[model samples]
Target chain A: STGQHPARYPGAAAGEPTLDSWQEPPHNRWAFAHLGEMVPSAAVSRRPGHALARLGAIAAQLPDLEQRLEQTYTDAFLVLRGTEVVAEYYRAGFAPDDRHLLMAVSKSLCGTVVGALVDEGRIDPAQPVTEYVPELAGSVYDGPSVLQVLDMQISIDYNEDYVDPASEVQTHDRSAGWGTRRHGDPADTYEFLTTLRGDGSTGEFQYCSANTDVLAWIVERVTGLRYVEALSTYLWAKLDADRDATITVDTTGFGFANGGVSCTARDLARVGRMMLDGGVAPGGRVVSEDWVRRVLAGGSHEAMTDKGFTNTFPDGSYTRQWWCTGNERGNVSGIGIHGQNLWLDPLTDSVIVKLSSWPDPYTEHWHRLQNGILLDVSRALDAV
Target chain B: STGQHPARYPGAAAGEPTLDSWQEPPHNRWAFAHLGEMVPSAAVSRRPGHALARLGAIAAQLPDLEQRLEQTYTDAFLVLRGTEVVAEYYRAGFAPDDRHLLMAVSKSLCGTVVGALVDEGRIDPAQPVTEYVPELAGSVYDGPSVLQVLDMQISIDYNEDYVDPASEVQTHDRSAGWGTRRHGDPADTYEFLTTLRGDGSTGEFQYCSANTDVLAWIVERVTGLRYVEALSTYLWAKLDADRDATITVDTTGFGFANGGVSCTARDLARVGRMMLDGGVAPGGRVVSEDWVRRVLAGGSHEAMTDKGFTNTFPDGSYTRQWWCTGNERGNVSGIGIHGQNLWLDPLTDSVIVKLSSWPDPYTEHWHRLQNGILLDVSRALDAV
Candidate 1:
């Protein structure tokens, strides 16, 4: 086995593993390439005190991994130690400044926004989503309280499979006709959500992009504003981002709640650090410290049983829509598709934000390399 | 006659007038209220000046005539004289900071980008569109060169009637499913253009959005980048923009070249001023003086038999995607739906940008008010 076998952990299976197994084609690469895009990655603004410059000396001393990484087709990549961006690299077409689509990173950001809203008493998590958006009165997610959505404990028959083309997501793609040609379909997000059939009971574990989608819709319906507008007011402006980032919206002009956000790597790291700094930034409190703690702790492990790929995380649990990893290994991180990761070690206050465009079903080998890089950098900083 | 109407300038008909007559109900209001939406109308940016504060003294003036302007549902109705904003009023919901969508105004911005590329010698107006986008090999626009597209002289049978729901513009809306369900239709700029089957000859001067769309597509296909990317590198960076504006893309991720851009009023004025100043900004040349002269001195008009939209202008011919008012008027302005305009008066070396959401078929009275504001500002600045 390689360096992290067991200590690193073995590939789930020698042969082509289960979709949930650690070994896959594009999972980790996707993780790296799309880290910032997949999570609610905040921008580490290049303000006077936060300016970044490439530290080429360190990369020169390391093995020539540039070509190897590119050959692997990274969507985006960044190297950092402590708060400094040592080196940043992107493939020919992508740029470090270009906001990669954050599929799940948006969810984490959503969690943060809600946390902020809750602290301000603008959003009562204990209240039903109906309080915010009575439009959901007859929908499948109607009964459960907002807190249930936050914990991802509400049971719904939504699929969380990334590879299954026949899953709910594929249906969404088909309806939106995204990456395809289909007519007489759903026109926008509101229409698409209405088509989703619901089953199971509230407060049961289910990881679905639809849950976050509903959360976003609820946030907007409650605030009487679009999600981006809310984000700008509740988060972005407070961060004083060096560059503005864009969140991709559905055809109906709704932000993709479960994912679909793009921002710079530095921005993502700043957000991770904000959590480490107790949910505050230069502008002020962005989220409640208590809510941040709850999210970091992950939801009760009771609901994590059917958490699909999150099963890979040690003592893995779901909390306020965020995945918990550090409970078992003390190295918690937010993992997203195509090699996107926000590896955070609260103990050391070390946060590594990696943005990548690794294609689908990323492999464990890719994760090994990614996690290994984080560990080595942590060592370099003597952070953890 | 109305207070400001010139004698014999025709009064409103017995009825409230029709929507198809002029660029009515400028869509920017609908667009601003719903920012981050579908393909936009024009591209405007926020002005570089500091936040404009309201003067209490002017609010009291309420000139009875200007008060009557609000009944017209003017998208924007504000007056600026010298350094003082005499009367600033807008329709409810849309504030001065709200990004306004400017249609056709996008063409002017596109021309600026093309000029920059020309400065780089990477793009030549003399070249065929097919040379850049081989995809247009057999299209009706294929016969006409790039210059023809810019000059609005291409003989495409596209009716640019916003009022008639049967016009090409309405067809595009139907295809995109605007105001209703668009099933198995052309809902985007490219799809709408690709569906044009009119065997129209190539230089009869049809006022069509298709020509600009095709021109933008060819620019993208040749440059291997999005049109917005081109603008960012060339024009946006040139003005040292206060805030970045967005160019709305079609379903295929290409910006709506014909009229899909969102910007603040200040940015719009800066762009107009830059053009008036011969494509140079505070420090250096943005687009060359040669390109500036060519755009202003009727380069594209030199080759076309029929001058597109000139009859409507009633001032002078169209040149290089710019409408000229000639030496007598010395005014060049971009026109869009409602009363959206960016009036550039070369004689006074002044630029005036206005945003509106006038109800459909803009009345001549609306233009009079718009141009009057432009004139008043120019005179005030000159007197200073």
Candidate 2:
């Protein structure tokens, strides 16, 4: 299907499919990386050539890599062993320089920035969000602690159904400058976030994208910097990324922290390595090791069961926007819809980065296949 | 006023000013350079450090430089001698990497791209625009030759008043994605352009921006590439600029070729220098030298008198989207509203690039002052 190269396809070039084309297949391959042109964005500059070295041959380690990659409609794929890149591959039109949209992976990265603020003693997770952003005092977030926002345990009346025309997530996308707007709707991120009503009780680990955006606002308030600047100082700049990444922003210049990050596969692999290295850099700590330890410790099985993710990862737990596999080897990941992921396996000292455009947003079969492939790669690397 | 730093002034960040911030004083300082974040944009990448080297001090050469700069609310300014940057300066937050909106200056650059296509035999200026873009068969552009469009001699019902809410230009902006829109309006460039009706005859020099956008469509139709991509291939890449530039686009991804170009002061200075070099580069020709020669020939004074620019330029002509001062020195310039200019004085071997945020869009006093300054600088450089 990628051989068709939809971006160059005659029908796609014309206005035949319309602007929301980015949400679908072949178009996703190009749109995921080029969102900056379609929406306003903030740059996160990198320090070039600061990435870990490459070594070994991933093709030899995993002979069926090509097949797995194609089946997933992968835009880019990479395998990192310890601090070295063992394998890297980009689909025909995609390149190492391209910055693919990270989608929900933005949530995990936002979590890391929160960890940095926590380490500086600038943010107290126990504090209510209104302490920093007084504008949210009347919203559903008024009574929740900042920690509850981070963990997505704050109850909010929001449904993230991409296919539903009238879904709250679509409204959020419009507000964040990622989707089209309706008549007389709130056109800014803060307005949309503050308008969401409470649908249920808190502390049940509900997965709501609005929670991450709320956390983004709090981060900006506490750091006295825009979300992009804080992200640059805390994580992106420290990672030694090869090129500047971008986060799409709203009309008010507020970044869409839920799923707006767009970065290269190599840079995201470096992020995986950072987690593998316990969030420490050569000069000093970038994100607190204690935070890494907490994420690594995983979440409660009861919470995971309550959230209805047991079918996917029976033993897995979700915390700090990162998912812990609960497998004895201590595997964790940051996953996005339409197949974007950063999978880190600490036991094998391996990390696999996959930026893909799966046909469906979330499919049980696709997830299982990807999980199997990661497990296979980790076990083989462990033997080596 | 300069001491206040109005962009960072207390209330600007708290939504004190909503949309249309680019028209005011200090907001224009930041808004001009950051239009990409406020509008959709397509990148024109460059190989870094490709520009001519910088040397000398502009202030030392011109004593009242600082005062002249502040009085005009200059965001960035540059002066080049032959191929080297003689002097360059960026205000507080502006930098060489920042891209400032060229406004009407975008027209001249689009003219260069048309010249490249003309040289390649891909576009014939004598032919009707409908030959390449049949979508405009019923519009005013249908009967006009491509040359007529280039010279802005088309019969179009258009007005470019910046402050008039009901001006025809505002409708064009909304359609081109540069301004807000009404419900159910044509939201794309091609649609809006084709829907416009002819208002007058097509034999006189008229300064209408819509003509340039129509020419942009013809370029895209003939080359089978987007306007920004054509610009990068034919001109920008040839200039060897230091950073990627951008052009704002509509929802249909059609670049606003009339006034959507946003580039750095130094990069634009490089463009001015290229004109002085007669479109020839070190290794080969980027644009046809013949086209530059045509622009240099200048238009007829009869047409200039008819157009009413006599009071400002006295002895000047407009041709091929460039303004020519019919002096012995053969000075040519690309001027934009709200203080953006690229002035080239061939006799003096000088080029002055000014990106400003003046209080008024089109002020006779500001124009007179800048013209005087340019003459002074040219004379000084000539004496040297």
TM-score of chain A of each: 0.75, 0.84
Which candidate has the highest TM-score of all?
A: 2
lDDT of 2 by residue, A77-116 (tens): 7888888777777766455676677779989989998999
The numbered model that scores best in DockQ is 2
| Candidate 1 structure quality by residue, lDDT tens digits, A1-384 | 100101111232222121122112323222111222211111111111122334354465445546545544444556544466666666554446655555577788787777777887888888987787666666776778888888777666656453575566666644432323245556555566665556748666776667777777666665655676676667776775665556654433356656556566767776787778788876788887887777677766666775343545546777776777644335556666656777676655667666655544357767666666655544544422
Interface RMSD of each: 18.2, 14.9
The alpha-carbon RMSD values of the candidates against the true structure, listed in the order shown, are 14.9, 11.8
User: What TM-score would each prediction reach against the true structure?
Assistant: 0.71, 0.84
Candidate 2 stretches greater than 4 Å from native = A1-56, A282-284, A306-309, B1-58, B282-284, B306-308
lDDT of 1: 0.56
Local distance difference test values of all predictions, in order: 0.56, 0.70
- Model 2 Cα lDDT, one tens digit per residue, B1-384: 001111222245422222333224444333222334443333322111122223255456778766776676666778888877777766664546766777789899999889888998999999988888777877788788889888877767776674674667777877766556777657567777877777647767778888888888888778766576777777777776776666666654467888777777877877787787888754346678889988888876656654335775677888888988887678888988767888888876778988776656666788877777777767767755
**Residue B340 CA error for candidate 1 (Å)?**
2.7
**What is candidate 2's local distance difference test score?**
0.70
> What does DockQ come to for candidate 2?
0.09
